[PDB]
Amino acid sequence: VRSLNSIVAVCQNMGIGKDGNLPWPPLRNEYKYFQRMTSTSHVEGKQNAVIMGKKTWFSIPEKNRPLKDRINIVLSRELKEAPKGAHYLSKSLDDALALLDSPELKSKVDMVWIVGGTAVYKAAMEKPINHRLFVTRILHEFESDTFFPEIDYKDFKLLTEYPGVPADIQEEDGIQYKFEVYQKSV
Numbered sequence: 001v002r003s004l005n006s007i008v009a010v011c012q013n014m015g016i017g018k019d020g021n022l023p024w025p026p027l028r029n030e031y032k033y034f035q036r037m038t039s040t041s042h043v044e045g046k047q048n049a050v051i052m053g054k055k056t057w058f059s060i061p062e063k064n065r066p067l068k069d070r071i072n073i074v075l076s077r078e079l080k081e082a083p084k085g086a087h088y089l090s091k092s093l094d095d096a097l098a099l100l101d102s103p104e105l106k107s108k109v110d111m112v113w114i115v116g117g118t119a120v121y122k123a124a125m126e127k128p129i130n131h132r133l134f135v136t137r138i139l140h141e142f143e144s145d146t147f148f149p150e151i152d153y154k155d156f157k158l159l160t161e162y163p164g165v166p167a168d169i170q171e172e173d174g175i176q177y178k179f180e181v182y183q184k185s186v
C-alpha cells in the first residue's frame with residue numbers, strides 16, 4: 001500500500017499486554033484516542049482498515065466486534081475462515097496488503113492501521129514502506145507479558161509535532177502518558 005500506520009499504547013518496559021488483556025485498567029480518553037484515530041478517514045465514502053492478529057481479535061469483547069466503522073482484518077495461519085464478525089482473514093501481512101490493493105477493497109479503503117499484537121507490528125515495521133507510528137507512552141509500570149518490538153531509532157524519526165495530537169503529557173485516573181509520532185520515510 002502507499003503507507004502504513006501503526007498505533008500502540010506502551011508502558012515503561014514497552015509492555016502492551018498481560019493475560020490476554022491490556023496491562024492497565026481502562027483509560028477512557030486514551031481509548032477514545034485509539035478510536036478517533038483508527039476510525040477517521042479523510043474521504044467521504046471510505047472507511048479505514050484495521051489489521052490485527054488472532055489474539056488481539058479475541059481480546060475484544062464479543063458483542064463489541066468487529067470494531068465499528070472500520071474493515072476488520074484478522075491474520076492467522078491456523079484459521080480456515082474469518083472469525084465471526086471479522087470482514088476478512090489473511091495468512092500474512094503481505095497477503096493482507098495485497099487484499100487491500102484488490103479492486104473491491106481499493107476504492108473502499110482510506111487508511112490502513114496495524115493494531116498489533118507484537119508479531120504484526122514487527123512485520124509492518126520491517127516493510128520498506130512509508131510508515132507512521134503512533135505511540136502512547138504511559139509513564140508507569142504495569143506487569144506485562146507481551147511487548148512492543150524494538151523501534152529502529154535510525155529509521156523511525158520522532159516528530160516534535162503532529163496535527164491533532166496533544167503535545168503535553170496527559171493524565172487520567174492518576175496516570176500520566178504522552179502521545180508520540182514516529183515517522184519512517186522511504
Ligand SMILES: NC(=O)c1ccc[n+]([C@@H]2O[C@H](COP(=O)([O-])OP(=O)(O)OC[C@H]3O[C@@H](n4cnc5c(N)ncnc54)[C@H](OP(=O)(O)O)[C@@H]3O)[C@@H](O)[C@H]2O)c1
Nearest residue numbers: 008009017020021053054055056076077078116117118119
Ligand atoms: N497496548 C496495545 O496497544 C495493544 C495492541 C494489541 C494488543 N494488545 C495486547 O496484546 C495481546 C495480544 O497480542 P499477541 O502479540 O500475543 O498476539 P496477536 O499478534 O494479537 O495474535 C497472534 C496470532 O495471530 C496470528 N499472527 C500474528 N502475527 C501474524 C503474521 N505476521 N502473519 C500471520 N499470522 C499472524 C497467529 O495466529 P495463529 O496461531 O492462528 O497463526 C499468531 O498466533 C493481548 O494482551 C492484547 O490485549 C495491546
Ligand SMILES: C[C@H](O)[C@H](O)C1=Nc2c(nc(N)[nH]c2=O)NC1
Nearest residue numbers: 007008009030031034115116136
Ligand atoms: C484493538 C484492541 O483494543 C487493542 O488491544 C489495541 N488497543 C489500543 C491500541 N492503541 C492504543 N493507543 N490504545 C489501545 O488501548 N491499539 C490496539
Ligand SMILES: [Ca+2]
Nearest residue numbers: 054076077078
Ligand atoms: Ca498458533
